[PDB]
Nucleic acid binder design. Structure first.
Ligand SMILES: [Mg+2]
Ligand SMILES: [Mg+2]
Ligand SMILES: [Mg+2]
Ligand SMILES: [Mg+2]
Ligand SMILES: [Mg+2]
Ligand SMILES: [Mg+2]
Ligand SMILES: [Mg+2]
Ligand SMILES: [Mg+2]
Ligand SMILES: [Mg+2]
Ligand SMILES: [Mg+2]
Ligand SMILES: [Mg+2]
Ligand SMILES: [Mg+2]
Ligand SMILES: [Mg+2]
Ligand SMILES: [Mg+2]
Ligand SMILES: [Mg+2]
Ligand SMILES: [Mg+2]
Ligand SMILES: [Mg+2]
Ligand SMILES: [Mg+2]
Ligand SMILES: [Mg+2]
Ligand SMILES: [Mg+2]
Ligand SMILES: [Mg+2]
Ligand SMILES: [Mg+2]
Ligand SMILES: [Mg+2]
Ligand SMILES: [Mg+2]
Ligand SMILES: [Mg+2]
Ligand SMILES: [Mg+2]
Ligand SMILES: [Mg+2]
Ligand SMILES: [Mg+2]
Ligand SMILES: [Mg+2]
Ligand SMILES: [Mg+2]
Ligand SMILES: [Mg+2]
Ligand SMILES: [Mg+2]
Ligand SMILES: [Mg+2]
Ligand SMILES: [Mg+2]
Ligand SMILES: [Mg+2]
Ligand SMILES: [Mg+2]
Ligand SMILES: [Mg+2]
Ligand SMILES: [Mg+2]
Ligand SMILES: [Mg+2]
Ligand SMILES: [Mg+2]
Ligand SMILES: [Mg+2]
Ligand SMILES: [Mg+2]
Ligand SMILES: [Mg+2]
Ligand SMILES: [Mg+2]
Ligand SMILES: [Mg+2]
Ligand SMILES: [Mg+2]
Ligand SMILES: [Mg+2]
Ligand SMILES: [Mg+2]
Ligand SMILES: [Mg+2]
Ligand SMILES: [Mg+2]
Ligand SMILES: [Mg+2]
Ligand SMILES: [Mg+2]
Ligand SMILES: [Mg+2]
Ligand SMILES: [Mg+2]
Ligand SMILES: [Mg+2]
Ligand SMILES: [Mg+2]
Ligand SMILES: [Mg+2]
Ligand SMILES: [Mg+2]
Ligand SMILES: [Mg+2]
Ligand SMILES: [Mg+2]
Ligand SMILES: [Mg+2]
Ligand SMILES: [Mg+2]
Ligand SMILES: [Mg+2]
Ligand SMILES: [Mg+2]
Ligand SMILES: [Mg+2]
Ligand SMILES: [Mg+2]
Ligand SMILES: [Mg+2]
Ligand SMILES: [Mg+2]
Ligand SMILES: [Mg+2]
Ligand SMILES: [Mg+2]
Ligand SMILES: [Mg+2]
Ligand SMILES: [Mg+2]
Ligand SMILES: [Mg+2]
Ligand SMILES: [Mg+2]
Ligand SMILES: [Mg+2]
Ligand SMILES: [Mg+2]
Ligand SMILES: [Mg+2]
Ligand SMILES: [Mg+2]
Ligand SMILES: [Mg+2]
Ligand SMILES: [Mg+2]
Ligand SMILES: [Mg+2]
Ligand SMILES: [Mg+2]
Ligand SMILES: [Mg+2]
Ligand SMILES: [Mg+2]
Ligand SMILES: [Mg+2]
Ligand SMILES: [Mg+2]
Ligand SMILES: [Mg+2]
Ligand SMILES: [Mg+2]
Ligand SMILES: [Mg+2]
Ligand SMILES: [Mg+2]
Ligand SMILES: [Mg+2]
Ligand SMILES: [Mg+2]
Lengths: 22, 77, 59
RNA sequence: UUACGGCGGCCACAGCGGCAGGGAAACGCCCGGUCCCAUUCCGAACCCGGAAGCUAAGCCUGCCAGCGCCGAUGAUACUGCCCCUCCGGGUGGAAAAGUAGGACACCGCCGAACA
RNA sequence: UGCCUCCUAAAAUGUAACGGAGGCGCCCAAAGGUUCCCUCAACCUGGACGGCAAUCAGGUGGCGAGUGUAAAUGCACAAGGGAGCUUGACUGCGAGACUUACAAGUCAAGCAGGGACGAAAGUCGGGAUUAGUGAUCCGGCACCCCCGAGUGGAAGGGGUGUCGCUCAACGGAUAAAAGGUACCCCGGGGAUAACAGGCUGAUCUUCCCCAAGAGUCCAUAUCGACGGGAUGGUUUGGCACCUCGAUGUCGGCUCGUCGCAUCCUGGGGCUGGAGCAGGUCCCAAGGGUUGGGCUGUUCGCCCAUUAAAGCGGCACGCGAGC
RNA sequence: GUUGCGUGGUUCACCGCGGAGGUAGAGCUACUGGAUGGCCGAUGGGUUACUGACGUCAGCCAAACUCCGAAUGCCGUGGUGUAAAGCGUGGCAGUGAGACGGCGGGGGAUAAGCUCCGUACGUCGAAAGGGAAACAGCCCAGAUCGCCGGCUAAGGCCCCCAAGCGUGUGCUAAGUGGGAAAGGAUGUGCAGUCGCAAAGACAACCAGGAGGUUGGCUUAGAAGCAGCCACCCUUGAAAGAGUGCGUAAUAGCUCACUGGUCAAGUGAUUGUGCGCCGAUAAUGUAGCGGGGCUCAAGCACACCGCCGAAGCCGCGGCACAUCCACCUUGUGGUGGGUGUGGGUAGGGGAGCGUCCCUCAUUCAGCGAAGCCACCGGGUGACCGGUGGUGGA
RNA sequence: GGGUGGUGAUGGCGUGCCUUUUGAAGAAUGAGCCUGCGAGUCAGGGACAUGUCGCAAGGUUAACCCGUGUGGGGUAGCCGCAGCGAAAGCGAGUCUGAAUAGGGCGACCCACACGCGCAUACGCGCGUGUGAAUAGUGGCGUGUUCUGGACCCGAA
């Protein structure tokens, strides 16, 4: 589940503004 | 699995509701509110209809109002 | 009196009403500026596109 | 102009209820059913014919918030659009409930006396 | 599987799922039209049989009743209840609308004819409304006399009205129709399953929080219910994202390699640890971790041992290695 | 979608005005249901400790509840604005497998990079460039061409890596930053709220801290102390048949409660900013992209610059659409504006190259075609020149 | 020193082509390379729409005939010329209908000019004309379409 959680958490970057595909 | 499709049917949407709003100019015969029962009542210059359709007897402007609790649709010529 | 509206953000991703309001002010691209009278219609337009423009009371 | 009579607007801020007061014309109850008409029985009602009696009631007036009804302002909920990781924030709207209160309606068309 | 009603449906309309609920494939000659009249249910009080609830009387009661039938919207001004007379449950039409891909579906003032009811005003082209239905074809019947294959007829055709489909898979491939294929073939698909990967983590797994209790007493030596929160991604699944112009499927063998949630060996804390042995928890992955019987087996049980006979991952590691 | 022919502002945006609503929310003695606790009380039940209808007092809940009820959205209308709106009718389509993200919902386990809808929502599809380490669908921004010019966006500025080891005020000690829950916690900074005290506060210390009321009983003893239980008064600074150890008890070490003795805060408690633990899978650090960073290069607030794209501006070239003025004012040219020029399916328009025929013309044994090389040219398909080879 | 042409230490950027997909650098498909070949064509007085040209209330021929030809004849036919109606039929009307009701379908055909029966000179109607797109009709081009193998290849 680590890969999923890390991919999901990388929306929380300033450049992404809390939003990211999938 | 369970064949719980006991309820999967519905009738067609009948496109009810107000068709000509207040202050809108209509010709005679033009239906103003198609509805079930008398949600609105025929006012002056408005006919009711066999299925409660509230058409215009005469041309003019639609206006909505209240007649002793009953809410009514009329045309001012 | 007489407002001065400059478009500063893109219309890319903007809603219908924002794009058409920018069109209605006549704004075309980033750092386009238009001069329009300060009436209710103009302030309604500016309110719709507030985040896409900056305005000043420039003569 | 009246504690009067007459028909609508409106459908509770108007209703319902309580307490008083009112009978000139009028509205009424009222007295009868030979006389049109009527009761799924009943002259109760409807209808007709009268004026012995009466404001007891309807009706009208006035007063009561009692049962109801209307109801802000503000605040909040919610929310359009923005900004922003949520939490949030800006901005434009803004309830329901509750509270202050309002409220025992208001307006329109002919006759009697007066005048 | 068509139709009707509601909710989903995000206060116009519309809106999907093998989403949540129900109805319909009729009925009524009055339950239609019209004129007139009426107001219900429930509650309270009194009353032969009669009682909680039959009929009666009086109150109170604005809709909690009823509506032919689902639901919704309506209807007490009644569309609900009753009575009289009737057939408009019309013919010829129809401005204009709604709805709609089309086909369909729906509403309609008003004009005329001839009527019904009404004193009149007026209302009536079925039913409070929205389901109770089926295109076209091909035929049938009645009427009209339109055409009438040389001519007169006739046959036959035509028009108008209307009839005949659980064509219900209900826009209705034929008037007429079931299965098997592991003997299978071809065209395709990772648009779609089986393996494996991926996401998820219900299930599984490993922990933890709270601590009712059990433990002679004592929750916390040990075990811990009811509940709660997570980890892992080794189970069974869910999803269907790569692969169907091929990613060989279980077990074994051979070779490994990694994690530690440690079976042994090593170090410790607590103990309901006297000692010997243990129990539990903590640290620790260096090495080690047997041979047989049964079963294809994994697993498991058993035999004999052992310090121990660990648990998992690596396409449930490994078939261009067997 | 495109394109032709018509129509002409009818489209769309904003402002105002006229309208229908039953979502969000809320409310429910306003209905239908669900439903908590009281009080009364019909019944039933064994005279009535049991039942507790109906009411009544309060507090609540609902997609298919509504006395109510937004914001938006929708319909119309009047103004204002806006070139490439709209509409009709023809020609030619393609598409009818969508994806993710935001917001509202269903299904699912309020799982899924799940599934099914809604959304004048977005992006991808069909969108390059910049940011996000890499990274269709997120953020910025829509590439006509050229430039060794400038300003910016998102994001950034210690080195990798362009621009800040920027400034001021604080916070963090956890490499937190640079993943995680219930929950555990005298971590720390800040904002509050009470108790005591120079009539001497908390910490530390000497003295002292008991008699009848040691009732019920388990019993060897219950005597507080194997357990439940009297449920109160009095020489006294204060002082219980007693707070925790402990024995069969008798006992024994002490705490509640003050005096003296020593000299300044000391305890509780709340919200918060930043931290700690919980923390835990398998090739190799492997959860800042790396180096490194607290002497911040981390965080918060305030401020100042700068970097940063194919965005914008500057200068130059091209093209399309449309408008205005001159020239046979529409076959249309010229000049100048204005706008526009990412693009898959697809539509429309205009061209390049090869071959053959016809007409005209012109090259060719002083060397055609074809091929090769080099030098040039055009916005593209491509073209030309020169030379070599070659032979019609 | 400068410019050609060759090479390219070194720095940055940078995920083949095609097909097909929501999405491929993809570990989806196809392709070893080169040269040559290999896919919307043709027929028809077909159909629809358009561009263009001829003639125009007309247009045009088919077979065929005569010519060394692509030329000249050839009116049969076709389309246009009036519609409405099931049809008889009627006709700028017609059908339904009882209807001097309503509806359906159909006619009111164009721009510029003159000429009249005349409005002071400016106009309703009706006629010449001029459109040598009028209005049709015929040819030719293009897109689509029909029947043919119909863009090409491929089964069992
Ligand atoms: Mg419906
Ligand atoms: Mg009906
Ligand atoms: Mg009197
Ligand atoms: Mg009497
Ligand atoms: Mg009285
Ligand atoms: Mg308010
Ligand atoms: Mg209120
Ligand atoms: Mg709706
Ligand atoms: Mg909506
Ligand atoms: Mg059924
Ligand atoms: Mg009847
Ligand atoms: Mg009735
Ligand atoms: Mg019938
Ligand atoms: Mg019609
Ligand atoms: Mg009549
Ligand atoms: Mg009569
Ligand atoms: Mg009628
Ligand atoms: Mg019915
Ligand atoms: Mg057939
Ligand atoms: Mg014959
Ligand atoms: Mg014959
Ligand atoms: Mg016959
Ligand atoms: Mg007929
Ligand atoms: Mg079907
Ligand atoms: Mg059939
Ligand atoms: Mg066999
Ligand atoms: Mg096959
Ligand atoms: Mg798939
Ligand atoms: Mg699988
Ligand atoms: Mg794989
Ligand atoms: Mg998990
Ligand atoms: Mg899917
Ligand atoms: Mg392959
Ligand atoms: Mg360990
Ligand atoms: Mg131990
Ligand atoms: Mg080991
Ligand atoms: Mg070692
Ligand atoms: Mg043996
Ligand atoms: Mg192993
Ligand atoms: Mg395997
Ligand atoms: Mg294995
Ligand atoms: Mg094997
Ligand atoms: Mg292998
Ligand atoms: Mg078109
Ligand atoms: Mg408004
Ligand atoms: Mg509103
Ligand atoms: Mg609703
Ligand atoms: Mg709600
Ligand atoms: Mg209730
Ligand atoms: Mg109760
Ligand atoms: Mg609701
Ligand atoms: Mg399809
Ligand atoms: Mg589809
Ligand atoms: Mg979809
Ligand atoms: Mg959602
Ligand atoms: Mg999906
Ligand atoms: Mg969405
Ligand atoms: Mg991009
Ligand atoms: Mg980019
Ligand atoms: Mg990058
Ligand atoms: Mg700069
Ligand atoms: Mg910035
Ligand atoms: Mg780099
Ligand atoms: Mg630098
Ligand atoms: Mg900084
Ligand atoms: Mg410094
Ligand atoms: Mg600094
Ligand atoms: Mg760190
Ligand atoms: Mg960290
Ligand atoms: Mg944490
Ligand atoms: Mg961690
Ligand atoms: Mg640009
Ligand atoms: Mg382009
Ligand atoms: Mg562009
Ligand atoms: Mg294309
Ligand atoms: Mg020679
Ligand atoms: Mg030579
Ligand atoms: Mg040649
Ligand atoms: Mg060359
Ligand atoms: Mg040459
Ligand atoms: Mg040569
Ligand atoms: Mg595609
Ligand atoms: Mg796929
Ligand atoms: Mg490949
Ligand atoms: Mg490859
Ligand atoms: Mg394939
Ligand atoms: Mg290959
Ligand atoms: Mg005909
Ligand atoms: Mg006619
Ligand atoms: Mg022509
Ligand atoms: Mg040709
Ligand atoms: Mg074929």
């Amino acid at each position: 589940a680590k890969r999923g959680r890390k991919k999901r958490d990388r929306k929380y970057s300033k450049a992404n503004h809390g939003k990211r595909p999938n | 699995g369970a064949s719980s499709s006991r309820n999967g049917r519905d009738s067609a949407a009948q496109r009810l509701g107000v068709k000509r709003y207040g202050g809108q100019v209509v010709k005679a015969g033009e239906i103003l509110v198609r509805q079930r029962g008398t949600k609105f009542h025929p006012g002056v210059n408005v006919g009711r209809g066999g299925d409660d359709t509230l058409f215009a007897k005469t041309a003019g402007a639609v206006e909505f109002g209240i007649k002793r609790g009953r809410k009514t649709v009329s045309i001012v010529g | 009196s007489q407002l001065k509206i400059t478009q500063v953000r893109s219309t890319i991703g903007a809603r219908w009403k924002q794009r058409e309001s920018l069109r209605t002010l006549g704004l075309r691209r980033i750092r386009h500026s238009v001069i329009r009278e300060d009436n209710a219609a103009t302030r309604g337009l500016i309110a719709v596109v507030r985040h896409l423009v900056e305005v000043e009371p420039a003569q």
